């Protein structure tokens, strides 16, 4: 078992084409005609798009091929749309008596707009209250490309801890989100008159409110 | 309850992953283990129309030693001529999940037609990818009589598979003339079969006389005995084989000429390649002719006679040999 | 197997061709 | 046809023993013919192979783990097993069900289960808290704050199932503490609210807890 190499990441525009790499010994892809394809998109499971180095199972696209020659595969995406972005494995048997995947590749469709997030901010609960703990709800939705920036305001008024931000995480719609969570005390809540979550897209700020 | 159907089967054999031979090495991948405990079942009150030379499975056993031909067994043009360990290994063949193999047990049942005593077996039994000519080797055997299949008999045009009920053996080595080579038999014992055959041809011919002969002219190949031992090609002559007069007052043992040969005529692709200078330790496959394949002159009609010569070369042939009796359904 | 050249060929002793698979027969 | 279905521990301590199983369905698993494999993915990096197990005895596994490594067939076979001794933090993966198979050739993974993840550490479990997240002020927002809760993950249904669309629960946070919060929303009528009432569905595994929550336009 080696380990098998492609790129780290393939690009390209719409309604173009491109290809994936994946090399490995003269035992892996060598070798056989066992190189198979799967692709990802977050978060799901594999997908068997390609089987024996260039055959493709029904209900697969038509612009999904596999060519092989010498140690090295080649999955070609011919007609690129904006949702076959995700990451693609590429993986053989070999002899040992096993299997092997290449490291992925991130493919990313260049030329996407970028696209503002909404927000929506929510106050502590009134039976979270009850439990003398706060925890305001900040909530980052639809912007290309995350990452975004997020501070907090009790009024003035810069703030941390106890802030709680999450990596962005790519959606179906290859837009990104994010959430963050700032914590308090219940009179640490009311002390202020209102509170703000400053999430910053790329160039612009967005602001959204909330008081008791 | 089933139709018809043809469908990619998967293979099974007793391949012992590490021993470096090539059917070994190629059935460790694309073949999968044995099963100790696998089971015929005898279907209800059954009979089946059969027909062995309309049967997918020996184009899929045909296209399997294809793909083991030419990747273990690499040609001098040059690529590179490794020499490795060659010995057949029986592979069985299988159904997928919701298709069925119907077996059928008619010993004297000439594959083709209704059948009766047929059982559904899981796998087909070790059948052993073995390419020859003339005659068919350590293969499997007729259980009863003899059984003389063809596709249509009247047409002098249909190679001819007779398979023995009665196995005699033939010794095939050469030394350490460095392609001299030789093939054993004995013949009391096998001019006695043949002689069962002929008797067992005129069942199949108006009781007219019966008669052998070389073949009319061909490629060596299919002229002579051509068949291969652990990776070197031999070519034997046969003559002394179906030799009349012999079976009378006659003679004991039996000596094949053969000569062992790098350049030759290739059955997966269309062209030729050469191979190597051979090992100049010895090689001995000792081999079972299980069965003989022929064709008939027939040409005159008539003629109060009928002639036959050896044939083969159509290595479907080689499988419908041993893949007569079975034959692949769907189910719901 | 190539037929026509294997009828061509057996021919030559004014026999008719026909392929054994990839080879080529006279008769 | 043909589904597979991961089931198993989702927190494995370390130095313990992980282990989880398939069940075939649509099935079987000894018709082929085909063999049954176990593959896991850490979070964010790439495809791993553990092994293969057929019908019959045989196993297939990957050099990099033999040395901990057992794959089985067991309810009337009609299911197989992965048992991964001496964890560490390493063996933090989502683990993937999967077919292949060999029929006379192909080997490739087709059939592949949702998978279920597997977090290897020794902080102990925690059911999370749910509260309302009230709709103010057509569309408006609401919903349930998951919070404070390990391992992951934890699926939050609404209404039942009955509300489908709308609803985007949102990735988790890994607060400073050892562990998890998080939201989910929807987007749904205003003219509804105050005749439609939304419940919440909150499930964590580990810890076993199905907590069903009322929004609550307070
Ligand atoms: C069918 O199979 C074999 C004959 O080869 C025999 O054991 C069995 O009795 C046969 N069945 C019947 C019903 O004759
Ligand atoms: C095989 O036998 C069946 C009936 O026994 C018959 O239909 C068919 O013509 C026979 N074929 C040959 C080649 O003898
Ligand atoms: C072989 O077949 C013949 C009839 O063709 C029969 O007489 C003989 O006994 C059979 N069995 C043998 C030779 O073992
Ligand atoms: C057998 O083949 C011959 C060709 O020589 C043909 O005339 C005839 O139709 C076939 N016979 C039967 C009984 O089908
Ligand atoms: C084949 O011939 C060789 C050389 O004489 C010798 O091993 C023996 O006589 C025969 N072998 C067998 C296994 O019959
Ligand atoms: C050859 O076969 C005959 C006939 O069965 C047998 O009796 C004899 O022992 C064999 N001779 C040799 C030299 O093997
Ligand atoms: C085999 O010997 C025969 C008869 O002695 C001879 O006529 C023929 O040339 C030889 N066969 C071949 C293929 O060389
Ligand atoms: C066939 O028979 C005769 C004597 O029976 C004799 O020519 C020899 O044994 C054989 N000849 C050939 C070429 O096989
Ligand atoms: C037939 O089988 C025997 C035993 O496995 C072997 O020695 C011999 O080489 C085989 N013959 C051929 C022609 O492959
Ligand atoms: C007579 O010859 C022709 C073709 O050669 C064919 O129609 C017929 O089957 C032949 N008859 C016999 C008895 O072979």
Redesign the pocket.
Known sequence: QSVLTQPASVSGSPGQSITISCTGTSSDVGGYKYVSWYQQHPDKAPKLMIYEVSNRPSGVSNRFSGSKSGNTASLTISGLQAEDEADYYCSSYTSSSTWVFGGGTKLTVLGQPKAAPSVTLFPPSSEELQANKATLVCLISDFYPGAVTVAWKADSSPVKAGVETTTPSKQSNNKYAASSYLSLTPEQWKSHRSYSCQVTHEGSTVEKTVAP | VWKDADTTLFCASDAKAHETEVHNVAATHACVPTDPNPQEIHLENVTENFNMWKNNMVEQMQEDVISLWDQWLQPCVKQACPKISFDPIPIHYCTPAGYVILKCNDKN??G???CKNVSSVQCTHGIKPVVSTQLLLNGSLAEEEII??????TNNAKTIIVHLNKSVEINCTRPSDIRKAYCEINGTKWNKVLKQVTEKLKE?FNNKTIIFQPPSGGDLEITMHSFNCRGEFFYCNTTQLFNNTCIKGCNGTITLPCKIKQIINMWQGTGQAMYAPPIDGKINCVSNITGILLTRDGGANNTSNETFRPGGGNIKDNWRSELYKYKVVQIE | XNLHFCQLRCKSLGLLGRCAXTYCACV | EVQLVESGPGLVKPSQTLSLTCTVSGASISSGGYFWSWIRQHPGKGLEWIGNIYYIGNTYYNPSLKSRLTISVDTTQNQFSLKLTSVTAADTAVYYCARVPRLRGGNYFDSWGQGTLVTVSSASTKGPSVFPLAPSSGTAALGCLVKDYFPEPVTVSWNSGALTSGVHTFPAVLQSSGLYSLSSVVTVPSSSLGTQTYICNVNHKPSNTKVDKRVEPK
């Not at chain 2, 003389?148 to 008999?153: C, K, V």
Request: net charge neutral; hydrophobic share 25%.
């Open positions: 049942f000439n083709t037609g209704p003389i299949r063809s596709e249509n008999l199949h």
